[PDB]
């Protein structure tokens, strides 16, 4: 959230110590790589028709 500058969802629960690890279809984005750590991709994808 731009205003409150607060992280939500799984990425949030990681930064605020709610969880120890996140195992889900979490996209590896630059904005997230800055606050948390992403392991190598376990599934490559993209936009399809």
């Amino acid at each position: 959230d731009a205003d409150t500058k607060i992280w939500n969802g799984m990425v949030g629960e990681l930064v605020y110590g709610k969880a120890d690890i996140a195992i889900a279809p979490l996209t590896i984005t630059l904005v997230r790589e800055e606050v948390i750590d992403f392991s190598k991709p376990f599934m490559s994808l993209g936009i399809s028709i």
């Binding site: 690890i21 979490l26 991709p41 376990f42 994808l45 993209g46 936009i47 028709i49």
Partner: protein, 220 residues
């Protein structure tokens, strides 16, 4: 009379032949899509994305040639080509008789293709390169271990195996994909069949006139 009638039927059968050819020539002209560039080069088939998400924001910020034009279209397309949820998008594709295409994540798409009534399919390669990963708090102890674990699983083909288990095996369809093989691709017997029934009908009519004729003769 016989000459003019002959010239008359000549024109008609020629017209029938010529006309029947245009319907078959165009029938071949039809070329389903396959790539994203195909969506931009045409307008007959509408298309859109989710009203909110990285998918929509992708085209908006994309400076790539093809994707640019696509966004320009979707940005002012009426009615709204954007849907509220992913379910709405799929429903729009299933109820437009192939007049509406929906752009979404390949992962979720591939899964939908393996769900009843098996009436959806992914076409062409992906538009961009993304990837999911295991997230761990910055400077965690599980960091390095998990990272290597993912690499180990992929090399053992365990990751590919898991996907096959939940995407294709879990199906199911598993049937709609074997019919989508795209085998057939020619003319047909249907039309020609209609002319066969009218033939046998004529033969039967004659077989009736024969007996009937005989009877008449006898009477005489």
């Amino acid at each position: 009379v016989g000459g003019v009638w002959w010239f008359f039927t000549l024109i008609i059968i020629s017209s029938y032949t010529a006309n029947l050819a245009a319907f078959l020539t165009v029938e071949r002209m039809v070329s389903p899509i396959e790539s994203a560039e195909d969506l931009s080069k045409q307008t007959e088939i509408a298309y859109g994305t989710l009203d909110s998400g990285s998918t929509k924001e992708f085209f908006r910020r994309s400076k790539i040639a093809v994707f640019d034009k696509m966004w320009t279209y979707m940005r002012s397309a009426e009615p709204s080509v954007f849907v509220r949820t992913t379910a709405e998008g799929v429903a729009r594709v299933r109820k437009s008789k192939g007049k509406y295409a929906y752009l979404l994540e390949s992962t979720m798409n591939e899964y939908i293709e393996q769900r009843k009534p098996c009436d959806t399919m992914k076409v062409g390669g992906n538009l961009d390169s993304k990837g999911y990963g295991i997230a761990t708090p910055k400077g965690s102890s599980l960091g390095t271990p998990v990272n290597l674990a993912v690499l180990k699983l992929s090399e053992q083909g365990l990751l590919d195996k898991l996907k096959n288990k939940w995407w294709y095996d879990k199906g199911e369809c598993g049937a709609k994909d074997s019919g989508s093989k795209e085998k057939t691709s020619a003319l047909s017997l249907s039309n020609v069949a209609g002319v066969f029934y009218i033939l046998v009908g004529g033969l039967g009519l004659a077989m009736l006139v024969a007996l009937i004729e005989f009877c008449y003769k006898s009477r005489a």
